[PDB]
Amino acid sequence: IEDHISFLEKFINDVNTLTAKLLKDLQTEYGISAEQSHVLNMLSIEALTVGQITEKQGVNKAAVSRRVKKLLNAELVKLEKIIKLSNKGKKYIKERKAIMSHIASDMTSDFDSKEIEKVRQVLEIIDYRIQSYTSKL
Amino acid sequence: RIEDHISFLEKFINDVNTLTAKLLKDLQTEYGISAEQSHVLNMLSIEALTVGQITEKQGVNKAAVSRRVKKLLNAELVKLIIKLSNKGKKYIKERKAIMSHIASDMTSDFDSKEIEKVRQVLEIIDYRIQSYTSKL
Ligand SMILES: CC1(C)S[C@@H]2[C@H](NC(=O)[C@H](N)c3ccccc3)C(=O)N2[C@H]1C(=O)O
Numbered sequence: 001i002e003d004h005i006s007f008l009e010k011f012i013n014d015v016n017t018l019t020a021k022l023l024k025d026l027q028t029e030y031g032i033s034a035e036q037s038h039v040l041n042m043l044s045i046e047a048l049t050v051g052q053i054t055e056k057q058g059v060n061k062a063a064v065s066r067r068v069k070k071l072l073n074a075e076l077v078k079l080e081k082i083i084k085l086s087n088k089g090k091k092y093i094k095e096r097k098a099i100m101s102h103i104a105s106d107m108t109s110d111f112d113s114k115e116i117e118k119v120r121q122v123l124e125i126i127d128y129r130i131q132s133y134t135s136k137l
Numbered sequence: 138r139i140e141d142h143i144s145f146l147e148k149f150i151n152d153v154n155t156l157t158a159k160l161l162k163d164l165q166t167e168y169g170i171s172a173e174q175s176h177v178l179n180m181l182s183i184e185a186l187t188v189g190q191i192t193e194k195q196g197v198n199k200a201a202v203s204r205r206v207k208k209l210l211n212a213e214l215v216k217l218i219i220k221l222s223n224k225g226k227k228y229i230k231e232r233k234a235i236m237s238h239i240a241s242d243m244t245s246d247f248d249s250k251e252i253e254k255v256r257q258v259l260e261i262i263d264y265r266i267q268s269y270t271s272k273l
């Protein structure tokens with residue numbers, strides 16, 4: 001009833017841990033950090049503003065500022081207000097899926113594609129419910 | 138075909154972080170710490186740990202992990218090869234209070250079975266994730 005909340009963290013931790021390690025070279029190659037990486041990954045979803053990102057990421061605005069501009073100067077992300085991704089930046093996310101998806105399907109090769117559908121419905125509804133709530137002051 | 142599920146997992150995660158980060162903002166303020174320092178306490182809510190450990194699981198900059206630790210010593214939410222404290226134990230309680238109270242309200246309409254079935258598919262995936270990781 002609550003070690004679900006504890007499992008979630010752990011589970012999230014573990015994913016983070018594995019992803020960081022998995023994407024170690026792909027980042028060094030583009031000379032980016034793990035967060036420069038995320039923001040990048042966090043931007044494949046929607047166009048944000050340094051404010052939108054600091055909030056969404058819960059950290060110091062100052063930090064979010066450089067990580068951000070360091071991406072402009074490296075031509076990975078671009079402008080309009082409205083921070084979007086540059087094609088170089090895309091090739092990156094492409095090589096991110098490319099890696100993620102390979103090890104991802106290994107651990108999922110024997111899943112009841114239907115049992116998974118049901119699982120996603122629940123998570124999707126929880127996802128929807130999280131976004132919903134997230135808005136309110 | 139499977140790429141779809143991944144995109145979701147990431148978003149679902151992103152949203153969890155956003156939410157937790159939004160819900161704890163004031164508490165991390167009320168005590169006077171940054172999320173960074175706050176994540177440290179949570180990895181200690183579960184157990185103990187030295188430097189190389191906390192520096193490895195998160196895995197971030199050797200120094201970074203160090204500098205936040207030393208700050209956590211001053212507020213005394215961490216005892217020294219690093220544990221929690223009376224004040225430390227207290228923060229988490231409060232942290233857990235909010236979280237659960239929301240997740241519950243946000244899930245207290247689901248079918249006991251539906252949920253568990255989720256936990257089990259997530260447990261096996263974590264199990265594999267971990268095993269794969271351990272292969273350095
Ligand atoms: C390539 C990535 C490492 S970037 C994205 C994010 N990485 C982070 O470091 C993120 N800022 C974070 C992690 C943990 C606590 C707080 C913040 C994550 O998860 N990521 C991988 C992805 O792209 O799938």
Ligand SMILES: CC1(C)S[C@@H]2[C@H](NC(=O)[C@H](N)c3ccccc3)C(=O)N2[C@H]1C(=O)O
Nearest residue numbers: 060061062063064065066067068069070073
């Ligand atoms: C030392 C750095 C982390 S900050 C420096 C500058 N980037 C900035 O955003 C600028 N300093 C600044 C503006 C606002 C808030 C915080 C920082 C630059 O380039 N940088 C980094 C580096 O040398 O790696």
